[PDB]
Every structure is written in C-alpha cells, then in structure tokens.
Design a binder for these strands. Structure first.
Ligand SMILES: [Mg+2]
Ligand SMILES: [Mg+2]
Ligand SMILES: [Mg+2]
Ligand SMILES: [Mg+2]
Ligand SMILES: [Mg+2]
Ligand SMILES: [Mg+2]
Ligand SMILES: [Mg+2]
Ligand SMILES: [Mg+2]
Ligand SMILES: [Mg+2]
Ligand SMILES: [Mg+2]
Ligand SMILES: [Mg+2]
Ligand SMILES: [Mg+2]
Ligand SMILES: [Mg+2]
Ligand SMILES: [Mg+2]
Ligand SMILES: [Mg+2]
Lengths: 244, 216, 16, 345, 130
RNA sequence: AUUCAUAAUAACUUUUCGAAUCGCAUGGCCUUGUGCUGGCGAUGGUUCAUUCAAAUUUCUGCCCUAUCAACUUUCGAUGGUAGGAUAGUGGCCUACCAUGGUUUCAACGGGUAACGGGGAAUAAGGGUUCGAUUCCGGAGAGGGAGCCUGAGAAACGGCUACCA
RNA sequence: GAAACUGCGAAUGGCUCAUUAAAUCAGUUAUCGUUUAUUUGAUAGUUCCUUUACUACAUGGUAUAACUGUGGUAAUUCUAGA
C-alpha cells in the first residue's frame, strides 16, 4: 500500500472476537490506542456482541455519545476505541463494572467486579528510563507513562495504578514463586506460578509455569504477566481460575 | 478595440468601443504598468493619464504580468497567481496566457485613470459607487472613525437597515478581537493553570526526593 | 478478593 | 442570549445547556397526558410503581432500598402498618442525593403519600424539608432531570393532600418561603407553580387569610415569587384565564386597597394585572375587568385614593387601550376619584 | 384465543428500555398484526403504545406460532429519541421524508459542483451576452 | 553489548516553541469598584513514550533448459578511505585506491499459456496436477519519463512532457 | 443558514495479474540503522536585566475570497480589471 489501512475484513479480524462470518463483509477496525490491534477488543464488540445491550452499530454510537461508558476512569466516545487487557469498563447507569480478562479459552470474558476493585488496575512495566530534566519514568503495557517511579520497579515487574489519579500504589517483582497469567500463545489465559526464568543471551527468554494442578508448561517471557503472589492474587480472577 | 477604463477613486468603470486605429497606435508596444496620455487617445481624454493593467485577447486569453512577449505562451501556473484558480491543493496547470506587450491581437484593454484631465467623463468622474461593507475589526473601526482609546467601538458600529414588507430592522457585524470579560477570564484561567501545574510538579519532585532519602 | 455477586420476568396476556 | 432557539434545525439530536432545559421546564403534572403506571393498581399505588421501578432503575442505592422494604410493601394493610419504617427508609435514601436513584425514590415518595394521605400529614413536615434540602443540594450538581423529579413529587403531594393543605395554605407556604425567596429565579419560579395549584383550589374565605399573610410578609425575591405564584394561578390556557381567576383578583384587590396592607402589595397587584393582561385575550378578561371596576367604585375613599389611582394607571398603561373593553367606565372612575392625593401619580 | 409471551427480558437503562423476545401463540389464525400486538404489549407493560416497538416476527413452519423481538421504552420521548427513523414511520410517529431518487440527487450534485459560487453573476453574464 | 538514557561547560542560529483561539454558565471575596478572583468543555503547542503504519534487513525454501561453461568488470563489477545524498545503513552516487565477486553443490544466458501463498482435485501410500478468482502480501491503472501537495503518492476518478 | 475562506479526507475502498525466476512470496530475524499525521499517557511560572520615550482591558495589511460592478472567448469545473 501507500499509506495506513482503514478497513478490516471479517475473515482477517482476530478470531477471539467471535464475529459471525456471514453477518457482513467488514469487521470493526480498532483505532489507534493503548493496546495493539490484535490484542484489543473494540468497544462496539464489547457492547453489542458480548453484553448484548445494543443491537447494531448505531445504538452503540448512541450509548457512547450519551457518555454512559467510562474506560480507564475516563469517558470515551469512539466506537472502535481499543479496550484491552486489564482495562476497567464502567457503566454507571447499570451500576456495572467489568475487567477485561481472557477466559481459559483465550477469549475476553465478561468479568464483573466491585467498585473497590475497579478503583485500581495492574500494568506490566515494559520500560524504565530517565526522561528529560533527569526525571525517571516507567512505561507500562497500556502505554501509561508514570513519572518518579519507585526505583526498585524494574522491567517485567507489575505496578498497581490508581485509576482516579494514575500513581503507583504498590508493585510486585518478577521472581520465582510469584503468580502469573499468560497473555499470549496456546497457553493463553492460563494462571500459574513461576518455577524458572530460563535466560538466553541475544534470544527470547523462556519461563516455566506450574499450575495448581501441578502441570508444567513453558511460555515466552513477553506473554507472562505477574498478578500476585501464590494464593493471593491482587485482582479477582474469572471462573475456573485459569485452569486448563 | 475596446477599452475598459476604471476610475478607482470613484470606484467607477465603463467600456468605450474604438474604431479609429490611431489611439491603438499610441497603445501598441506598451506594457502592463506603463502610462499613456489620454490626449493621444482622444480629445475626450485630453489631459488624462491611463495606466495599463491588463486585458483579454480576441480568443479571450488574459494578459499576464512578468512575461515580456507580444504573443501567447503556455505557462505552468501554481497557487497564488493571476489567471489561475487551483481546484485541488497543490494543483499546477499549464495554460495559455497572452503576453504583457500590447498588440493588435488584444480585444479588450483594462486601464486605470491615474490622473484626471480637463474635461469630465460622463460615466467615470461624475458618478460614484459606495463601499459595500464597513470595518469589522475593532481597531479598524477606531481607525475609520478616529476613535480615542477611552471611547468604545460598540457605539460606533456601522449598521445597515433592512426592510422586509412592513417589518424593518438593522444588522451589524460581530466585532472580532474585542476586549470583553470572557477574554480576561480565559487569560486569567490560563495563568492559574500554569502556576498550579508548576506547584504540582514541585510537590511531586519533593516527594520523590523524600522517598530516595528514606531508602538511602 | 471475591468477584461481585451475580444478580424482569415474563408476563402473559390472553385475548379474543 | 438575545435570541432563543426559535427556528429548529433539521438535526434529530441537538445540544441543550442546563439553563436552557431549566427555562423550558414547567411544573404542571396535570398537563402531562402520558399513561401513568399507578393509574393501574391491583394492591396499592406504591406497589404498582415499586414493581415497575425495580426492573428499570438498576442503581446501587435503589437496589439496596428495594431489598430493605420489599417484604413490608406487598399489601396495602402491610404498608399502613409499616408506614413509619417505609417513610424513614425513603427519607434516608433521598438524603444521599444519588442522582441515579432519585427518580424512583422521589416517585415512590409521591405514591407513598397517595396510598395513605391523611396519615401522611404527620409525615408532611419531614417530607417537605427533605425535598427542600434535595433541591438546595441539586443546585450544586447541575441536572434538569433532578429538579423535574423533585418538583413533580412536590406537586403530586399537594394534589393528594389538596383538601388538608388548602385549609392551612399559609402553613404550607411558610415551609417553602426559602424556595420562593431563593436567589435563583427558576427555583422560585418552579415552587410558585407548585403552590399555585393549591391556590386555585383554595376557597375564597381561606384564600383571603392566605393573601393577607403573604401581603404581610412583603411588608429578597419574595416579591418576584409571589408575582409568579398568582399569575400562573390565573393563566390556564393560551389567550384564556382560569374560571377562579375572578375570585382571586377580587380577593387580591380588596386586600391591596385595604389600608392595613403595605403599599408594596398594590405594586404586586399592578404587576399581576400586567402579566394576565398580556397573556389573555379580550374576551377572557371581561369577567376580570367587571369585578375590578365594580370594587373600585365600592371601595373608593380618601385613605385609599392613591392606591386606586396607582392600579388604574396600571390598567390604562397595560398594552395601551387594546385590552380595555370600554373607556367610558374608566372616565367615570376618574372623575369620581377627582371629585372625592399625589399630584405626580 | 391469542397468547402473548415475553422472555429473555433485559433492562437496558443505557437506552432506557426493555428488550425481550415475543412468542405469539395464535391457533386457528394466520398471524397477529404488529399494531394489535403493540396494543397488548402496551397494556401489559402499562406504557404508551407509542413507546412499544415490535419487529422481526417469523411464523414457525406449520403455523400456529410466531417468534420475534420487542422493545418497551420507559417513555414516549425516549422512543422518539432512540427508534430508527423507518420504524417511527411504520408506527406513524414520524412522517416519511420525500426525496428524489439517488440518481437525480447525484446529478444535481454534479451540476452544483460544476457551478462556482452563488451563480447569480453567471446568470446575469449569460443574460447580457445573449 | 554502545559514543545508550540523562546531565554539565563554551559558543552558535535569515531558526523554532513557550495559547493575541472558541462554547456553555455566573459561583466566591471584599475597602462597592462595570474592583479582585473563579467552574465545566472544545481546539491548538515543545519533547518523550504508546498505537496505527512505512522503509530496509538476517537465514532456508522456487518450473523447464548443459546441443547455455564460464560470467561480472571500458559506461561499478568485489572491497577500502573520504565526501555528497537520505528519514536513515549501504557503490545509492561522486573522487582516489587496490583486483576483486559467482561457478559442474549448474554461475551466466534462454523459455515460461510464472503474481506467490493459505488452498483445490486425485491417490491405499508415495506422488502428480491445478491455484486470475471471497483471506494475506506484491505490482499496475493505454506505453515510457518527471513531479506539486501533503505525515503518508513517483497518485493517475492529481499535474507536465513524449509515443499510439 | 446558501456561498466562500479555513481544517480534515481524497494515499482507504474496488478492479486486474501485464511485468516479475532469490525478484515477489512463506516461515523466521534485526533496527544499538530510520520517518511516523492520528489515538492514548505524561510534559513548559525562567523574578530581573538602561530609550519605562512602554498595546496586553490583546498588534498589522506588510490581504484576499465569497460579494458589488465593468468585460473577453465558438467552446471547458477558463477567467481579466476595479
Ligand atoms: Mg532484544
Ligand atoms: Mg481547501
Ligand atoms: Mg559514508
Ligand atoms: Mg568512480
Ligand atoms: Mg503472465
Ligand atoms: Mg493465487
Ligand atoms: Mg501504484
Ligand atoms: Mg484498457
Ligand atoms: Mg502515473
Ligand atoms: Mg484511485
Ligand atoms: Mg530468465
Ligand atoms: Mg533472499
Ligand atoms: Mg484525524
Ligand atoms: Mg497528544
Ligand atoms: Mg482586488
């Protein structure tokens, strides 16, 4: 092509969305945003094909511009806004709060949470660097730049972010024995505990994870997301607790 | 050939058809922006001075300034030029244009009356055309009426009366760049926001420093 | 922490 | 500001400012002709609306409210027996001022009064005080819907308690003086409509006591609130006046001309006359005109000459002479005044 | 006799309405008109007829039963606000807008883009020319 | 893994940026002044990160032909240095240098009714054939060449020349 | 609220397989080798420094369209002068 594409064929859309192949010819193309295209759920899909509150695109537009939907504690009006993993969606009129977490099948599951849980989210530390004026900052998996991080917070760690103000309440190191969640690959959506981080210079690191059933599997480090210490997750987990 | 004369000071303009070739003789070989004496053109123009502004040829192609030829040529015209209006942004078009040298191929020649002669032309100097619109910016209004700074432009806005049927009212422009309480509000709010941001950043830096001191 | 607990009924009319 | 949105765009959806909605809003529940759920009842008004609201509104507060009182609202005898607990719960949840739950709660409060009206009287004082705090709280967070819900609940209570409140109409206004005298114009405007319904339902005798009290009060924004109160009571439909309009003017006119009343009261009458005169046509004003002219002639005297002259000057100025049926009566009135004062007037 | 049955009822305060599936049992009858069904749903839900919408009704093979989808808005104004234009036209709540065929509109749009500006000056120019 | 991030010193610049923008609404202080202060939004703006993208790029894999055995290098072919150019690496181009680079493990040349793939058909299995054609990627807009605009085009339902 | 200026888009979509035999393409790598509108999150008090002889209660045409009016051409989404 000669420039960015603006259309997405239904057969080319991510499989986990569950879009009927015969319903139409095109699927919602996620706009630019915090999460990548393939790992995101546009709000139209969530409101129409998952919650069934809206019957087609147009009532979804109506709902959004009514400002009844809040993502990340902020009102969003773009139908194709790319909501993604660990994003908090609030519908105050219905008094409903959702956290986007994959099921064991690998599909974003409608997981209802309390307001107290909705007050905070988790972000994997993708980068830690000194910015201008010598101010350290951390970039999380959702593109949030948080300045003046705790200097122990390192790459691959996870930080608890307050939605209202966007500061780091607490953090978890990436160590053996911590509780992790798989965000990619065939093991997607599984929950377990670390056993070893196998390290390859100049190559992709590999992590061995043991589930509650004692089964062990290996996944690339990029697909691992720490969510707590064993037996004490910092977020409510979906039904099944990431087993199988 | 035809002369389209304009008296800009009046804003007036009129066309004179020409038959005798001698005034065209005095017209030949001249260029856009040069001046000619009306008395050579005719007694009716005795004492007048005409500046050549442009013209259109027998085929209707216009004259262009900057090209010193007596014949037509195809020029690649771009944005912000005479004789071309780009339909699309960045569009450049090759179009035929007549040269700036007056010749026998010119159908109509546009003239500007630089100076008035002895006799008064019936259609130009005798008649006047008012300005279509008045000042809209506040400073333009002040310049137009020479208003002092203390005096307000609000009372001196030019107003035009419109009568529809038996109903009648007046219309005025919306003054722009007008100093109003809202603009003061916005400026003050901007300054307050800047100072608040600075204070918040200082507090954040101090808190980070205290954290570092606690650990060390 | 525990997830939030889960939470219109059909109505019938006969005529003619 | 100068021009309202007189010409409507083809847009199906158009932005509306909070002030714009408030200006268009009018408190007149009788005017709304939509089907009301409580019109159909099997056990009680409260239960009928309560079941409906349980499904629609899903706010956290209302759900907690519904769970607490679900058992005690099944039958009307149950409601009457547990009336005290029901009212306390309603007031407590309304006090939270949660806009997502106000609409069902406020409606249920009105329907609560409907089911037990004479018994609600002991609850009347607290109910009004709660609404006043709600409306005062409503000013902070702008929501035209909240005001609409609140004042309609106030209007509904008056409708159900019309007979009792009318007997002590002065008492009802005494509760709502802060609303009628509030700094905001619309709050005074909305309340005045609510009271006016009680006013047009008032007997002439009980009306006379009421007008004297407010007339005494006039002796901040109370003047403006009363003007809206009376004028709305007069106006019923476009280019027409209410049937009881004549009685109210006769009562108002007598007290204004009475010397005990303050001079400010006559000004209020002058303002009242202007509003109705502009609003109404020739024909609907004729019964009003006749009762005024008759009373001026009857009550003419030295002590009240100046007041009569003031109101008469209001009549002649009002829309020039277009609304005046017959000028000859005014001329006759004038020469009686001159024969029987303030030169400037 | 005709039986009307509502199932899978979901409250949608986002659209301020009630969404549900309509089952119509109509023995010895071809089917029931959308109008009559709107009457009966309005009576059942204690809401205005104007606030009730019904569509997508299919008679099951062999007759005697129909299944479709139904909406009950909280009040009529919201229905006017949220309904599609065509359904409002079906219910008469809105008047059908009269427009030319797509080809005529497009041809007029082409003719309009050809002319630059108001065109009155072009009209007077052609008038004086001829 | 770094001349990384960042910071510091000295100068420099036809040299930038640091809100002369807009809607709704009228709250709070008083020394009572059209005094001071003040809310909810839109649109702009430096730098960083993220996202959508783009460009190059590491390794392995293509049908027939040896009656195509040597090819590339004069007019860049292989590599070194310096410069120009570009968003940027790089013989991409320029100046000076060396004589290099591929090949019977088929280079080079020729043919291809050659867009490639996910796939389709057949078959017991190995295999054989098809795949313009609902999805991804590449190229094109009668055939060459060159460009304005714009973040993004060598665009053609944009432009200029030449051929038909 | 026509028209016009301004901003954005028109570089997506749709069509076809001409050219192309390590080229495209599939899988797999790198950018510590570079551009990136838009989305999203952060991010900028520099007090002072001679002519203060001082606009910030807010600077200019160093300017024009639409528009008024005078015109050319057989003709075009042609346009000249004022
Ligand atoms: Mg790496
Ligand atoms: Mg433009
Ligand atoms: Mg180099
Ligand atoms: Mg060379
Ligand atoms: Mg071919
Ligand atoms: Mg193919
Ligand atoms: Mg192309
Ligand atoms: Mg062809
Ligand atoms: Mg081309
Ligand atoms: Mg195209
Ligand atoms: Mg070949
Ligand atoms: Mg290769
Ligand atoms: Mg954009
Ligand atoms: Mg930004
Ligand atoms: Mg001009």
């Amino acid at each position: 092509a000669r420039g960015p594409k603006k259309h997405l064929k239904r057969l080319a859309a991510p499989h986990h969305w569950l879009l009927d192949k015969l319903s139409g010819c095109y699927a919602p193309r996620p706009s630019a945003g915090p999460h990548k295209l393939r790992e995101s759920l546009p709000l139209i899909v969530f409101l129409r094909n998952r919650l069934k509150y809206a019957l087609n695109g147009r009532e979804v537009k109506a709902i959004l511009m009514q400002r009844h939907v809040k993502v990340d504690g902020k009102v969003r009006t773009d139908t194709t806004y790319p909501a993604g993993f660990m994003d908090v969606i609030t519908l105050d009129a219905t008094n409903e709060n959702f956290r986007l977490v994959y099921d064991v099948k690998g599909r974003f599951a409608v997981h209802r949470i309390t307001d107290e849980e909705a007050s905070y989210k988790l972000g994997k530390v993708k980068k830690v660097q000194l910015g201008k004026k010598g101010v350290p900052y951390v970039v999380t998996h959702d593109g949030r730049t948080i300045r003046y991080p705790d200097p122990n917070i390192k790459v691959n760690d996870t930080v608890k972010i307050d939605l209202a103000s966007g500061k780091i309440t607490d953090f978890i190191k990436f160590d053996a024995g911590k509780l992790v969640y798989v965000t990619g690959g065939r093991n997607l959506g599984r929950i377990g505990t670390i056993v070893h981080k196998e390290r390859h210079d100049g190559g992709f690191d590999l992590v061995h994870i043991k589930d509650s059933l004692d089964n062990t599997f290996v996944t690339r480090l990029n697909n691992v997301f720490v969510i707590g210490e064993q037996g004490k997750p910092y977020i409510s987990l979906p039904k099944g607790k990431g087993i199988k | 050939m035809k002369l389209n004369i304009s008296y800009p000071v009046n804003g007036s303009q009129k066309t004179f058809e020409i038959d005798d070739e001698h005034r065209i003789r005095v017209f030949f070989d001249k260029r856009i922006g040069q001046e000619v004496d009306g008395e050579a053109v005719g007694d009716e123009f005795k004492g007048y001075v005409f500046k050549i502004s442009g013209g259109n040829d027998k085929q209707g192609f216009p004259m262009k300034q900057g090209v010193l030829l007596p014949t037509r040529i195809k020029l690649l015209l771009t944005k912000n030029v005479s004789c071309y209006r780009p339909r699309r942004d960045g569009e450049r078009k090759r179009k035929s244009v007549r040269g700036a040298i007056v010749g026998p191929d010119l159908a109509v020649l546009a003239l500007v009356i630089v100076k008035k002669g002895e006799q008064e032309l019936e259609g130009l100097t005798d008649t006047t055309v008012p300005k279509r619109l008045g000042p809209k910016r506040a400073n333009n209004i002040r310049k137009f009426f020479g208003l002092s700074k203390e005096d307000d432009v609000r009372d001196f806005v030019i107003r035009r009366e419109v009568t529809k049927g038996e109903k009648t009212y007046t219309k005025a422009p919306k003054i722009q760049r007008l100093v109003t309480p809202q603009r003061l509000q916005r400026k003050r709010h901007q300054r307050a926001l800047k100072v608040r941001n600075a204070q918040a950043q200082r507090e954040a830096a101090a808190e980070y420093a205290q954290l570092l001191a606690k650990r060390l | 922490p525990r997830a939030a607990k889960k939470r219109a009924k059909g109505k019938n009319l006969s005529f003619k | 500001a100068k021009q309202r949105q007189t010409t409507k765009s083809s847009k199906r959806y158009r932005y509306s400012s909070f002030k714009a909605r408030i200006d268009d809003l009018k408190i007149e529940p009788a005017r709304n002709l939509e089907k009301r759920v409580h019109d159909y009842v099997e056990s009680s008004h409260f239960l009928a609306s309560f079941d409906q609201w349980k499904e629609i509104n899903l706010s956290a507060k209302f759900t907690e409210f519904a769970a607490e009182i679900e058992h005690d609202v099944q039958t009307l005898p149950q409601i009457l027996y547990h009336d005290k607990k029901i009212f306390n719960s309603l007031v407590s949840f309304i006090n939270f001022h949660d806009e997502f739950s106000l609409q069902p709660l406020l409606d249920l409060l009105a329907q609560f009064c409907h089911d037990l009206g004479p018994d609600f009287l002991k609850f009347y004082e607290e109910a009004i005080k709660t609404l006043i705090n709600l409306l005062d709280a409503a000013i902070e967070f702008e929501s035209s819907n909240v005001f609409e819900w609140g004042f309609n609940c106030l209007a509904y209570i008056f409708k159900y308690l019309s007979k009792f409140l009318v007997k002590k109409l002065v008492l009802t206004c005494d509760l709502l003086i802060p609303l009628l005298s509030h700094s905001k114009e619309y709050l005074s405007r909305f309340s005045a409509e609510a009271l006016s319904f009680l006013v047009r339902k008032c007997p002439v005798s009980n009306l006379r006591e009421f007008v004297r009290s407010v007339f005494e009060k006039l002796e901040t924004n109370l003047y403006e609130g009363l003007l809206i109160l009376f004028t709305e009571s007069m106006t019923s439909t476009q280019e027409t006046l209410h049937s009881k309009a004549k009685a109210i003017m006769s009562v108002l006119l007598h007290e204004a001309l009475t010397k005990s009343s303050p001079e400010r009261s006559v000004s209020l009458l002058s303002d009242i006359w202007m509003n109705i005169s502009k609003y109404a046509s020739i024909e609907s004003l004729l019964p009003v005109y006749e009762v005024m002219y008759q009373d001026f002639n009857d009550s003419l005297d030295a002590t009240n000459i100046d007041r009569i002259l003031k109101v008469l000057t209001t009549i002649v100025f009002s829309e020039s002479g277009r609304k005046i049926p017959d000028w000859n009566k005014i001329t006759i009135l004038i020469e009686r005044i001159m024969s029987q004062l303030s030169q400037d007037k | 006799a005709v039986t009307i049955r509502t199932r899978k009822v979901i409250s949608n305060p986002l659209l301020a309405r009630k969404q549900f599936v309509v089952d119509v049992l109509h023995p010895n009858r071809a089917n029931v008109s959308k109008d009559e069904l709107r009457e009966k749903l309005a009576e059942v839900y204690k809401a205005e007829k104007d606030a009730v919408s019904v569509f997508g009704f299919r008679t099951q093979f062999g007759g005697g039963k129909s299944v479709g989808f139904g909406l009950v808005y909280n009040s009529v104004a919201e229905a006017k606000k949220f309904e599609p234009t065509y359904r409002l036209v079906r219910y008469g709540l809105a008047e059908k807008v009269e427009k030319a065929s797509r080809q005529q509109r497009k041809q007029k749009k082409n003719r309009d883009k050809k002319i630059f500006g108001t065109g009155k000056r072009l009209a007077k120019k052609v008038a004086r020319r001829n």
